[PDB]
């Protein structure tokens, strides 16, 4: 309960600082060719060519049966593919006409606008069932807002903004109808319906708030700034949006870590960024949270979590492969003054020149024009401290100058997209995973619900952890780490994992600690049991070519990198193959990965283990 936005301003403040008549718009007038040419640079010929490919595009109708099919079989794409094709065509035509300015794409822009007004709804078939009737087919008497419609509305709102005058010379009824449509589909419902789930008014402990909140609020805000010219109404809308986005800010951890990982980052933190940018532009910079430390940390998480060559930290149900929109990361970094994020975005270009963002997100497409020149000039660098420590999320990243990156966590077995992974770690060498975290599989019916933890990728058994007295970690809020420390100077992470295990595990304490020096990672386990009932087992997950050249040495060679894992000789080491049937995994790891199991006949109440990993 920080309520940063409500603290920065109330409705009265708003009315005083809002900029009317779209005077906040940062792009040249459509008629201002010279300014368009300077801004566009070599985006110009590129966008013109993209536009030219759409001069005979046939606007796709979406049939009733395409919406009905979501109820019949679960099929989303039958409806979404034509929808998105139309939305991308309209977005591209907008950029091409800005680029050229000779009227050549105006007729297709007009067609696209008009057809969109004729559609009963801009809501995806998969989301329409939130409406009162609970059906997947649009109900012409009612509109809700979803991720799609919000974006559709904002795009239409921008097309109205740039092309009203040429449209009106052709026939003023087109722009009239667009204003009515955006009113019925965005403005009205946004103001009149308090109960949309992603707005999070009336939010209750236990309910979820997620990326839908800053994403939909950012799209709504644009529609208001572009289309609502009554200031009393506008101030009320904007204020409503700040109270709504305050709920998201409130729920997010202050340390800046996105515990869903980097593939939500873009539409989570990145749409919070978008929202604050639009809110700042809309108030002449007077209502801005972009200087807040927390916002900078949310941005930088993308940088710190990105190991290299596509590989990212992937605690929880998250892909080990990752990436980002470099242009967005730049604009975010510039806005919160992170040179790290700006250098990072240039590194993420992989030596390409930055061009306009295409797709269907008007705001991002337009904003990408403003940033291309500067990002093109930025020096590519992925620098960062040796240690990043997120104390509230309990994620610790530690690196050395000879290519080792370790990610470790404390936490609790009820995070978003939870894996039972209190205490785990991941090791990368020159960006390549060497001790890995499997990550996300294809969804089944067992994925949510009891039985979630019957899927192997969610079990502690298949993370880099012990089975204490042969027992794994248990799912649940109070199965958790205690006394997690990170000593940033010495690169020591340490946590007691005992409480993440159930009573059957009969453990008092188990301290799992990671130390990273310039050449090597040392893992230690120091444990006290209530009763020695079964041998403990220690597991490590890996891939490539694994060899066992003597007791207790394992060598791992993968993608050019080579390590040795030194383990206590009381342990017998075995390698189990895990043939990957699931494409969502085999597309990251290939055909198979391995669990190294370490098993003993010894049983005692007290013990410690040391393991050491170094390059060779
Ligand atoms: Zn995992």
Residue numbers in the entry: 28 to 643
Provide the authors' original text about this structure.
The C-terminal domain possesses an extended loop region between β-strands 5 and 6 (Leu455-Leu484: BtPL33HA, and Ile464-Leu493: BcPL33HA), forming an octahedral Zn2+ coordination site [supported by anomalous X-ray diffraction data], along with the loop region between α-helices 12 and 13 from the N-terminal domain. The two domains oppose each other in such a way that a deep, open-ended cleft is formed resembling an active site that would be compatible with an endo-processive mode of action of BtPL33HA and BcPL33HA. Analysis of the five enzymes via SEC-coupled light scattering and SAXS indicated that the three PL33_1 enzymes BtPL33HA, BcPL33HA, and BsPL33Heparosan are dimeric, while the PL33_2 enzymes ObPL33CS and ObPL33Gellan are monomeric. SAXS data indicate that the dimeric enzymes all bind as head-to-head homodimers, generating elongated envelopes. This is consistent with PISA analysis of the crystal structures of BtPL33HA and BcPL33HA which predicted a buried surface area of ~1,388 Å2 and 1,006 Å2, and a complex significance score of 0.207 and 0.290, respectively. This differs significantly from the wide-open cleft observed in the crystal structures of both BtPL33HA and BcPL33HA. Next, we performed molecular dynamic simulations to determine the extent of PL33 conformational plasticity, using the BtPL33HA crystal structure model.
PLs selectively target glycans composed of uronic acids with a C4 hydroxyl group linked to the preceding sugar in the glycan chain. The enzymes are 68% identical and contain a larger N-terminal α-helical (α/α)6 toroid domain (residues 21 to 401; BtPL33HA numbering used throughout this section unless specified) and a smaller β-sheet C-terminal domain (residues 402 to 635).
